[PDB]
Design a protein around this ligand. Structure first.
Ligand SMILES: O=c1[nH]cnc2c1ncn2[C@@H]1O[C@H](COP(=O)(O)O)[C@@H](O)[C@H]1O
Ligand SMILES: O=c1[nH]cnc2c1ncn2[C@@H]1O[C@H](COP(=O)(O)O)[C@@H](O)[C@H]1O
Ligand SMILES: O=c1[nH]cnc2c1ncn2[C@@H]1O[C@H](COP(=O)(O)O)[C@@H](O)[C@H]1O
Lengths: 201, 425, 81, 426
């Protein structure tokens, strides 16, 4: 198995193609490669990172800030979009109708919603700012009712019932962290502690 | 059944985020405490015996806010605390080794071998009369009075002189030590090029029109405090705190009317109220600011015992709205648990907040450090929270983030422009 | 006092059941992530250093969703992920 | 047959019997010999733990009578520095004063004078102290663009003191030379700092500072018994360390014994501590290899639960002491010390001093900086414990109380005179 420059990448036999696990629900691209996102910050000096990922074939780019409704975010988003007219971009986070159109006009392909509800919710308490997650999602959804630009419910998803409620509020997908941290495939090493299994960092 | 309304506390609201051109590190934390006193951070320290004495009232002024010396002490010491703050300059060496005109030259040489002949100030009952140096004893003319340098050829600075002006005096007079006197030429300390150099630099000091740290002091609304007030006003207190458990009492309103006619110019804070009516009442009595907080204190003993109180958010907004035209600010007092509560308080209309529990137990608060169990506490016990400056940073860190999130660059924009949502549990 | 409204979280609502011709095992979990990217399950993994790296971002894509490689790393390794 | 050597006791098994006593607690002699030649003022050592002992803490402790041991989780080039910071540390010496060079324009000098005073600017060109300029030097009016080199005081007419000079000697030199500030050089006449009469007064007075024959604070430092540590040793001894700690979890290992024999063959005069052992033979083994003191403590713990090996602390000490009766090689009680009582028991078992770890972590001087978390103060790298000075005072208050009760005026008497009772759990 070679690549574009005839550099060796691997090999395949009738048998190894046979034991290859069959994932019928793979999210694949128009080219059957698995789809991948990658996240960068909204600060200055990330331009080189983006170009590297876009070069690396990232499918969708995540511009994540703790305040998606900041003018600097809106600007760096306006810039990246003019640069990659075709690149799929996700901006966040907002929790208002105004924050949502702002991100869409800046040129987002999707909008991520969630100011305050994260698992380890450190805002509010510290800053006093936040929105209960259901109201935020419905408000952003209603503001984007015509744009074909989807909304993501981010953070605070405890059980599967919360997922259902998120979507029924208008969300097109949900983003989860706590529910997934600690699975085999997440970063960290398996460690036996006390008398139980944990993922040691 | 007479139920006036529903009333909201901190846990009842969240602040809504907005468009923002505000970075947190570029936010303006200053605010007007009264028409004439302007804070750099919107924080007051409670006039509690476990919270505010001269030491902590200094630390907070250095940080942008104002401390209020509690009243649970004799006047002669309280007016002293007000001075200890007003006159505090960190560069001044106080209580240095001195002599008297009577000191035997014999005794002069003994001390010289243990402090050097750089110069022992000569005082006759605290009044600075001269200084005797090694050049004076090898030069010779017995007692110090015969060899000392007279008052006429002394280079001094008055207390409260700026530091750069003292530095200029030291260089232009070619000296390395300069004595610090007061109005009556009594010795107060000394300054060198070095001690002015190690003096901690507090750029956010709340200082007066004269560069002295600003200090408040609290008294009660009872009769018999008239002598205390006059003592503090004499001691240079910047703002006077008339604190009662019911600021809306006619006796409070009267003693306030009296103190105001007496000191037409003295900045006065009256409290506590929790209603629109209680607020105008205090303003008309002549308050410069109004403190709000009936029921929410940390160790909330009212309500439960008396049944009276108002959730803090509703109280503040109501007082603020009633004072919308007077240029008289409102203070949110008690119940501030986290920095988010501060932000909510201000956005409700508050111009500053007063805190107690958050500050009790810092190094600078009253009490002694004591090791107990296996942890550090402040023994009078409370949990040692370390230096005040660290707490303030964490707390204002929180407030800046809120203002960054809400698109409010100034305290005043936050008080007027920020919006709320009501929430459940 | 400027209180925009009341705001609701998960514990505040329940979903009402309706007439249904839908068996759970026949439900379509796919959804459009953008106009051009369509997921098979409506799930994204957070771009958290404790959550998403190349390994988990692969596992989730195999399952219908998309993982987001966190940014707490040098570029040369992130583009690699 | 079941091979049980004996019965073995820990701290909680014994109490000290009170005795007739002419001993007041504040008059008890807390001093004791750490090695045949090194004598402490309080009988305390700080553990060479990255959470316990660094340069900062090990100074505070020497000032109060004991010795800290720089932990070994740091580069050779850095561990040697921590050792040197302690030996040369004089808080009375101003260490970073403003200097100039002969190249310095006088114009720049009047600028600095307006900012530090003409008390005296040390003139240095490439570290060698060459002179000083004072305002008395700046009489007569400088022509355009002069440099300090023309007006300064020469090297020969300077009044200096060497580093490590006692402080009253400096006062004597300061007074008799009728000066207000005096430069402190080194062996090669390199500028090391300066001292004033006031800087000597604000130096807090530690009457029980544990110092060497030259008044420098004493410091220890720890290394491993693995191969390849010789260079670190050479670097540490070069840094002037007072005592070397070779710490392993099994001091009775033949490999430990070897690195000791080598280090001893190499540095015959260096005071060396080996550990840890818990038996009569392990101590005798370590003494033969060449230790100046022996550290005792095998699971005083996680070592006991994972390997099953260990010896209760009291009998372990008594056995080592019993074996070292006559050698002048002291025993150190290491680990498991929770209160002042365990300390007292340790010594009465025969130990000459103790080593503590947990008790010190979180002190101001311990490594890490203070951080507030959940309204409480902690040491971020644990419960913040405040100043070391008080913990020592609190701990030694307890020890002092004990010596009054057992009628032991000196540490050595406590190690020899005090009696025990064997007690139960109830
Ligand atoms: O420090 C933080 N404050 C607020 N939100 C965070 C922080 N760290 C991660 N998040 C967000 O929390 C979300 C995960 O929420 P979870 O599903 O409840 O664990 C992710 O989308 C992150 O962007
Ligand atoms: O016994 C009391 N009952 C009611 N309020 C008090 C009492 N003692 C102090 N306070 C107030 O409580 C406020 C401090 O609240 P904190 O910030 O929650 O500790 C101060 O402004 C005091 O005036
Ligand atoms: N770790 C061990 O912990 C001991 C001291 O810890 P302590 O029990 O907290 O006094 C040291 O002697 C090390 O060997």
């Amino acid at each position: 198995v070679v690549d574009e420059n005839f550099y060796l990448r691997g090999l395949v036999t009738f048998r190894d193609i046979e034991k290859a696990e069959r994932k019928p629900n793979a999210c694949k691209d128009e080219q059957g490669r698995l789809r991948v996102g990658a996240a960068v910050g909204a600060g200055a000096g990330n331009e080189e990172r983006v170009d590297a990922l876009v070069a690396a074939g990232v499918d969708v780019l995540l511009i994540d800030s703790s305040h998606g409704h900041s003018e600097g975010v809106l600007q760096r988003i306006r810039e990246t979009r003019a640069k990659y007219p075709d690149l799929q971009i996700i901006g966040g986070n907002v929790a208002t109708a105004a924050g949502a159109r702002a991100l869409a006009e800046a040129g987002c392909s999707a909008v991520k919603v969630g100011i305050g509800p994260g698992s380890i919710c450190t805002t509010r308490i510290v800053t006093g700012v936040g929105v209960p997650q259901i109201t935020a999602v419905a408000d952003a959804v209603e503001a984007l009712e015509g744009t074909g630009i989807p909304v993501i419910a981010d953070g605070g998803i405890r059980f599967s019932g919360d997922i259902a409620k998120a979507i029924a509020a208008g969300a097109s997908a949900v983003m989860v962290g706590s529910m997934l941290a600690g699975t085999e495939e997440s970063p960290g090493e398996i460690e036996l502690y006390q008398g139980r299994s944990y993922k040691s960092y | 059944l007479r139920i006036a309304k529903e009333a909201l506390t901190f846990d009842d609201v969240l602040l809504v985020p907005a468009h923002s051109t505000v970075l947190p590190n570029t936010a303006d934390l200053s605010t007007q405490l009264t028409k004439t006193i302007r804070l750099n951070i919107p924080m007051l320290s409670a006039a509690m015996d476990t919270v505010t004495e001269a030491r902590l009232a200094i630390a907070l002024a250095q940080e942008g806010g104002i401390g209020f010396i509690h009243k649970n002490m004799s006047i002669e010491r309280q007016a002293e605390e007000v001075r200890r703050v007003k006159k505090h300059e960190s560069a001044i060496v106080r209580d240095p080794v001195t002599v008297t005109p009577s000191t035997k030259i014999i005794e002069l040489l003994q001390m010289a071998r243990e402090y050097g002949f750089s110069g022992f100030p000569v005082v006759e009952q605290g009044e600075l009369v001269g200084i005797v140096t090694g050049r004076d004893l090898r030069v010779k003319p017995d007692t110090v009075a015969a060899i000392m340098t007279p008052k006429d050829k002394l280079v001094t600075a008055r207390e409260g002189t700026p530091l750069e002006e003292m530095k200029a005096k030291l260089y232009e007079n070619r000296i390395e030590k300069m004595l610090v006197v007061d109005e009556n030429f009594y010795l107060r300390g000394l300054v060198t090029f070095r001690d002015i150099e190690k003096a901690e630099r507090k750029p956010n000091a709340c200082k007066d029109e004269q560069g002295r740290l600003r200090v408040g002091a609290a008294v009660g609304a009872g009769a018999g405090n008239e002598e205390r007030v006059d003592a503090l006003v004499a001691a240079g207190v910047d703002v006077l705190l008339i604190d009662s458990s019911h600021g809306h009492s006619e006796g409070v309103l009267q003693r306030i009317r009296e103190t105001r006619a007496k000191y037409p110019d003295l900045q006065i804070i009256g409290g506590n109220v929790a209603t629109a009516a209680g607020a105008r009442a205090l303003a008309e009595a002549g308050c410069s600011a109004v403190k709000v907080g009936i029921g929410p204190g940390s160790i909330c003993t009212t309500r439960i015992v008396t049944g009276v109180g108002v959730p803090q958010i509703t109280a503040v907004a109501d007082a603020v709205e009633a004072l919308e035209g007077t240029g008289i600010p409102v203070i949110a007092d008690g119940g501030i648990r986290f920095s988010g509560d501060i932000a909510k308080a201000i956005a409700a209309g508050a111009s500053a907040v007063m805190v107690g529990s958050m500050l009790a137990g810092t190094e600078e608060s009253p009490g002694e450090i004591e090791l107990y169990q296996g942890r550090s506490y402040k023994s009078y016990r409370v949990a040692y929270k370390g230096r005040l400056k660290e707490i303030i940073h964490q707390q204002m860190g929180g407030l800046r983030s809120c203002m960054g999130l809400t698109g409010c660059g100034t305290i005043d924009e936050l008080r007027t422009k920020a919006e709320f949502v009501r929430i459940s549990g």
